[model samples]
Target: VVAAAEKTKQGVLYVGSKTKEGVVHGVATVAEKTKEQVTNVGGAVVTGVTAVAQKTVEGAGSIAAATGFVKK
Candidate 1:
């Protein structure tokens, strides 16, 4: 769900990915940050959360239709 890289005097290069229901559908990367760096942290969090929200919306719509609360 997430990945990272390390540094040893040179900058760091980090790459991350996210998944939902066993499907990888989002990614992120970061580079060059001193001291316990967390690169693209905001973007990564947003991506994963957004993906889940998207699916939740779709699932809710489907449930609504199935329950006859919304038209087919």
Candidate 2:
């Protein structure tokens, strides 16, 4: 689905999504801002991600899933 990270002091956010082929697209700044708005509403500090991972892949494909966060 998605993964996110942030620099709380600077209010900078980063977010990414898993491609259909199970690739992790690096966090897009714009999308991160949007996520920040939501998380902020709940009073959560946007900080470096302590841990992140793909929870699931909800589509059809051969490479339905991958093993790591980096490109091979």
Candidate 3:
């Protein structure tokens, strides 16, 4: 009832398969290149994120101290 309904409802096998093949190849190639470029730039990315954990606060109550609300 999905493809069979819409496909045959308009143009049946010839037009359905024609446009179907065109769509599959178009989307298939586009996303593959985008995924390949998602490289992990080791340490530069990790070091920056690591800074948050290393420098956030030395102890539990220090977070409020680091933010300076405790000083006021």
Candidate 4:
């Protein structure tokens, strides 16, 4: 989930996230061009984070299956 967001003095949009267990993760920055542009940049950051999470889960599942701890 998103843990923080801010607009820098130089007008850059910064976004970050953290895990529930308190591990910080996923930081993104975009130059503030227009309102729509900044929003789209934030959306892109979220999309990237989601993709990483999906890949991690898939990797874990593969390990589990290979170890005979779980079935495909």
Candidate 3 per-residue lDDT over residues 1-72, each given as its tens digit: 112212233333321222332311211223543634332222222332123343443333321211122222
Number of backbone-clashing residue pairs for each candidate, in the order shown: 0, 1, 0, 0
> Which window of 10 residues has the lowest lDDT sum in candidate 2?
36-45
Score residue 1 of candidate 1 by CA lDDT. Answer: 30
* Model 2 regions lying over 4 Å from their true place: 1-10, 23-72
- Residues 1-72 of candidate 2: C-alpha lDDT, one tens digit per residue: 344433344366566654454433333345543433322122223334334434344443232222333334
Q: Best by lDDT, which number? A: 1
| Candidate 1 TM-score versus the reference | 0.16
Q: Highest TM-score: give the candidate number.
A: 1
Against the unseen true structure, what C-alpha lDDT does each candidate score? 0.39, 0.38, 0.27, 0.39
In candidate 4, what are the lDDT values of residues 1-72, reduced to their tens digit?
Answer: 324334445466545666455433565555766654322222333434334432243222322211123235
lDDT of candidate 1 vs native?
0.39
Model 3: residues with Cα > 4 Å off, grouped in runs: 1-36, 44-72
| Preferred candidate (lDDT higher): 1 or 2 | 1
In candidate 2 the C-alpha lDDT for residue 24 amounts to 37
Q: Rank the candidates by TM-score, best first.
A: 1, 2, 4, 3
TM-score of each: 0.16, 0.15, 0.12, 0.15
